[PDB]
Write a protein that binds this ligand. Structure first.
Ligand SMILES: */[SH]=c1/[nH]c(N)nc2[nH]cnc12
Ligand SMILES: [Cl-]
Ligand SMILES: [Cl-]
Ligand SMILES: [Cl-]
Ligand SMILES: [Cl-]
Ligand SMILES: [Cl-]
Ligand code: NA
Ligand code: NA
Ligand code: NA
Ligand code: NA
Ligand code: NA
Ligand SMILES: [Zn+2]
Lengths: 327, 76
C-alpha cells in the first residue's frame, strides 16, 4: 500500500518530504523491497553501511504498513547525520540539499567500483565511460545524466565542448509568462545561449586573449529519473527572498527532445512526485505529493498525515522539487 | 583555468581559478561578482554539493566545467 506517514522528529518535514518522494520512486523502492542492495553493500567496518540499511528498512516499513500508520525515521536520521553532520541538529533545512547528501551517501555505499580529434558525440561517450568507471551504482542507474556544454569564441569561431554528469537540474525561473510561467520556459532559460562578455569574458585558447563567448547547455544523456529543482531565490545582496512564482509543470508527457544533443524517442517523462515548500527562505513547512507506483493514485504526505488528492490539486506555486520518470 | 557558474536567474558568470583553489575561495570569488555571502551559497557539480575545506582538484573539476549555484528554502 505505501500510505504510511513519517513522524516529525523536530523540524524534519524536509527529510520526510524527500523520503516519501524516494519511497514512491518505483525502481528505488523495489531495490529496497526485493532486498537487492544486500549483495551490493560494501564490506569493511565504518564504510557507512547502516545508512543504506536504515534507509531500506524505512522504505520496507512504509510499504508494509496499514494506511495512516505513522513510521519513525529516528534510526535513519542517526545514520544520515553521521554521514552528513550538517543534519545533526533539529533545525529547519533545505530538501534539495538533503536529497543531494542522501543520494551521495546511498550511492557511495553500493558503488560497484586531449579529445580534439573526436566528434562531439564520441567525446561525450568516452567521458561517460570514464565517469561510470568511477561511479557505478543502482542509485546512479536511476538519477545520473550527462550535460554537454558548448562554448564558442565569437571572434575565431572555435567551439570548446565539455561533458558534465548531473544527478538533478537546478532551473532558473522565468520572470515572464504570457498567461503563466511554464516548466518548459524554465528549461529554456537553463539551456539558453548565455553571453559571456564584459567582466565575464572567457580567455580563448586560440585567440590567446579574453573574448566574447557564447555558452550553451544541451542534454547528452537523459536519466531514468529526472529531478528538477526550481531556483526559488531572489538576487538580493542584502536580504535574499523566496520567489513564489507559479510554475506550471505537466503531470504527463514532458517531452524534452528539443533539449537533447541528438534527436531521441526516449526523453518523455511523467511526473510521480513533488516536494513542496511553504514559507520564506528562513523558515517554513515541507509537504510531498506522490503517485503510488502500484495504483497510479496521488496522495498528500503532510506532518504524518497521508490523504488522497486529485491530480488537479498537484500543481501549486509551492512546488520546489519535481520528480519525473522516463515514460 | 576558467570555470563557470550558472547563477540564480538565467545568467552564467566566469571564474578564474586554480585546481588548488578551496571551495571557500570559489565562494569568495562568487561573492565578489554576485554579492551572495559564502555561507548562503551551495554549489552543485556532478550531483555533489561542494564542501568547504576541499579543493576543486578534490572533485576532479576541470576547465570549463559549470557549477550550479543554489541557495536554501529552509523548512521543518
Ligand atoms: S512531516 C512529514 N511526514 C510525511 N510523511 N511526509 C511529509 N512530507 C512533507 N512533510 C512530511
Ligand atoms: Cl562491517
Ligand atoms: Cl522570503
Ligand atoms: Cl542569473
Ligand atoms: Cl583557496
Ligand atoms: Cl555549502
Ligand atoms: Na572501525
Ligand atoms: Na566548453
Ligand atoms: Na541573493
Ligand atoms: Na559525482
Ligand atoms: Na563550458
Ligand atoms: Zn577565439
Amino acid at each position: 500500500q505505501g500510505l504510511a506517514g513519517l513522524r516529525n522528529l523536530g523540524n524534519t518535514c524536509f527529510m520526510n518530504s524527500i523520503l516519501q518522494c524516494l519511497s514512491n520512486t518505483r525502481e528505488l523502492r523495489d531495490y529496497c523491497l526485493q532486498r537487492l542492495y544486500m549483495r551490493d553493500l560494501h564490506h569493511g567496518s565504518n564504510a557507512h553501511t547502516a545508512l543504506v540499511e536504515e534507509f531500506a528498512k524505512l522504505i520496507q516499513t512504509i510499504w508494509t504498513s496499514s494506511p495512516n500508520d505513522v513510521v519513525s525515521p529516528s534510526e535513519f536520521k542517526t545514520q544520515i547525520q553521521r554521514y552528513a553532520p550538517r543534519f545533526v541538529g533539529y533545525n529547519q533545512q533545505d530538501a534539495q540539499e538533503f536529497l543531494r547528501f542522501l543520494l551521495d551517501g546511498l550511492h557511495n555505499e553500493v558503488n560497484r567500483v586531449n579529445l580534439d580529434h573526436l566528434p562531439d558525440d564520441e567525446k561525450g561517450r568516452q567521458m561517460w565511460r570514464k565517469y561510470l568507471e568511477r561511479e557505478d551504482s543502482r542509485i546512479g542507474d536511476l538519477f545520473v545524466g550527462q550535460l554537454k556544454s558548448s562554448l564558442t569564441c565569437t571572434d575565431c569561431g572555435y567551439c570548446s565542448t565539455v561533458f558534465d554528469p548531473f544527478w538533478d537540474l537546478s532551473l532558473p525561473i522565468a520572470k515572464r509568462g504570457y498567461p503563466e510561467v511554464t516548466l518548459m520556459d524554465c528549461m529554456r532559460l537553463f539551456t539558453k545561449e548565455d553571453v559571456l562578455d564584459g567582466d565575464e569574458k572567457p580567455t580563448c585558447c586560440r585567440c590567446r586573449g579574453r573574448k566574447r563567448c557564447i555558452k550553451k547547455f544541451s542534454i547528452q544523456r537523459f536519466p531514468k529519473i529526472l529531478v528538477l529543482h526550481l531556483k526559488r531565490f531572489s538576487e538580493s545582496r542584502i536580504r535574499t527572498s523566496k520567489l513564489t512564482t507559479f510554475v506550471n509543470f505537466p503531470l504527463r508527457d514532458l517531452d524534452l527532445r528539443e533539449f537533447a544533443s541528438e534527436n531521441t524517442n526516449h526523453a518523455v517523462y511523467n511526473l510521480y512526485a513533488v516536494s513542496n515548500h511553504s514559507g520564506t527562505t528562513m523558515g517554513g513547512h515541507y509537504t510531498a505529493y506522490c503517485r503510488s507506483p502500484g495504483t497510479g493514485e496521488w496522495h498528500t504526505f503532510n506532518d504524518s498525515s497521508v490523504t488522497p488528492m486529485s491530480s488537479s490539486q498537484v500543481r501549486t506555486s509551492d512546488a520546489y522539487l519535481l520528480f519525473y520518470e522516463l515514460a | 583555468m576558467q570555470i563557470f557558474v550558472k547563477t540564480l536567474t538565467g545568467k552564467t558568470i566566469t571564474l578564474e581559478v586554480e585546481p588548488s583553489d578551496t571551495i571557500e575561495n570559489v565562494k569568495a570569488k562568487i561573492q565578489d561578482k554576485e554579492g551572495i555571502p559564502p555561507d548562503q551559497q551551495r554549489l552543485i557539480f556532478a550531483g555533489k554539493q561542494l564542501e568547504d575545506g576541499r579543493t576543486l582538484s578534490d572533485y576532479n573539476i576541470q576547465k570549463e566545467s559549470t557549477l550550479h549555484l543554489v541557495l536554501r528554502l529552509r523548512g521543518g
